[PDB]
C-alpha cells in the first residue's frame, strides 16, 4: 500500500533522521543484562521484554551490530538511567572512565526509557 511520507517534514528533523539511520548501520549496540539495583521479578521481566523488543529493532530495521560486550559498543543501552548505577558497578565504573574523554567517539549511555523514546521518534510503534 502506499508508504507514508511526511511532506511537512523540515530540513532539520529530515537531517537528523538520515544521519541516524545512516551512523546506526556502522555501530555496535549492547544491550546491557545488569540492572542498577534491585527489583521485584515481575518489575525485572517488563524491562527485559522492552529490551529485548529494542534489541529487535536495533538489529533488525536499524541494522547496528549487536554485541554481549558493552566495551566495544557505541550505544549502550541501559535497564535505568545512569545515575542509578552504583559505583561498585562496571556501568559506572566505565561511565566515568570516559567521562572527561573529549573525545567525539567515545560510548553513549541511554536508560531503556531514552531510548525508546529515540525510537518512537524515528518512525517505529513503540510503546
Ligand atoms: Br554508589
Ligand atoms: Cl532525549
Same mark, same amino acid.
Given at each position: 500500500g502506499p508508504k507514508p511520507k511526511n511532506t511537512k517534514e523540515n530540513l532539520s528533523k529530515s537531517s537528523w533522521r538520515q544521519e541516524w539511520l545512516a551512523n546506526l ?5 549492547? &544491550?546491557?543484562? /545488569? ?6 521479578? $515481575?518489575?525485572?521481566? *517488563?524491562?527485559?521484554?522492552?529490551? +529485548?523488543?529494542?534489541?529487535?529493532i536495533?538489529?533488525?530495521n536499524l ?14 543501552? &541501559?535497564?535505568? /538511567? ?6 561498585? $558497578?562496571?556501568?559506572? *565504573?566505565?561511565?566515568?572512565?570516559? +567521562? ?17 523514546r529515540f525510537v518512537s521518534n524515528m518512525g517505529f510503534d513503540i510503546?
Open positions: 548501520k556502522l555501530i555496535s549496540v549492547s &544491550l546491557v543484562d /545488569e540492572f542498577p539495583s534491585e527489583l521485584s521479578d $515481575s518489575d525485572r521481566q *517488563i524491562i527485559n521484554e522492552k529490551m +529485548q523488543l529494542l534489541k529487535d536495533f538489529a533488525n541494522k547496528s551490530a549487536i554485541s554481549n560486550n558493552f566495551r566495544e559498543s557505541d550505544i549502550i543501552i &541501559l535497564k535505568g /538511567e545512569i545515575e542509578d548505577y552504583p559505583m561498585s $558497578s562496571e556501568i559506572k *565504573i566505565y561511565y566515568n572512565e570516559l +567521562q572527561n574523554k573529549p573525545d567525539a567517539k567515545k560510548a553513549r549511555f541511554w536508560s531503556f526509557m531514552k531510548t525508546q510503546q
